[PDB]
Amino acid sequence: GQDRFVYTCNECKHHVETRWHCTVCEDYDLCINCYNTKSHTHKMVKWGLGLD
Ligand SMILES: [Zn+2]
Ligand SMILES: [Zn+2]
């Protein structure tokens, strides 16, 4: 999910201002903490606006 400065963590299914985003999955996302632990190993991108 995305907005011009908002995003989601598809692991929290809550909003984030900075996400890791799977370009494999259908616009799947992870906040920093989830990316750091949930070990999503796929071809991603990152969009960030506050806590990169
Ligand atoms: Zn993925
Ligand atoms: Zn998360």
From Swiss-Prot:
Zn(2+) 4 binds at residues 9, 12, 31, 34. A zinc finger (ZZ-type) spans 4-52. It is found in: Cytoplasm; Nucleus. The modification N6-acetyllysine is found at residues 43, 46. It comes from the Eukaryota. Methylation of the KIX domain by CARM1 blocks association with CREB. This results in the blockade of CREB signaling, and in activation of apoptotic response. Sumoylation negatively regulates transcriptional activity via the recruitment of DAAX. Zn(2+) 5 binds at residues 22, 25, 40, 42. Acetylates histones, giving a specific tag for transcriptional activation. Mediates acetylation of histone H3 at 'Lys-18' and 'Lys-27' (H3K18ac and H3K27ac, respectively). Also acetylates non-histone proteins, like DDX21, FBL, IRF2, MAFG, NCOA3, POLR1E/PAF53 and FOXO1. Binds specifically to phosphorylated CREB and enhances its transcriptional activity toward cAMP-responsive genes. Acts as a coactivator of ALX1. Acts as a circadian transcriptional coactivator which enhances the activity of the circadian transcriptional activators: NPAS2-BMAL1 and CLOCK-BMAL1 heterodimers. Part of a complex composed of MSX3, CREBBP/CBP AND EP300/p300; the interaction with MSX3 decreases histone acetylation activity. Interacts with DHX9 (via N-terminus); this interaction mediates association with RNA polymerase II holoenzyme and stimulates CREB-dependent transcriptional activation. Interacts (via transactivation domain and C-terminus) with PCNA; the interaction occurs on chromatin in UV-irradiated damaged cells. Found in a complex containing NCOA2; NCOA3; IKKA; IKKB and IKBKG. Probably part of a complex with HIF1A and EP300. The TAZ-type 1 domain interacts with HIF1A. This is Histone lysine acetyltransferase CREBBP. It comes from Mus musculus (Mouse). The lineage of its organism: Eukaryota, Metazoa, Chordata, Craniata, Vertebrata. The gene is Crebbp. The chain holds residues 1700 to 1751 of 2441 of the full protein.
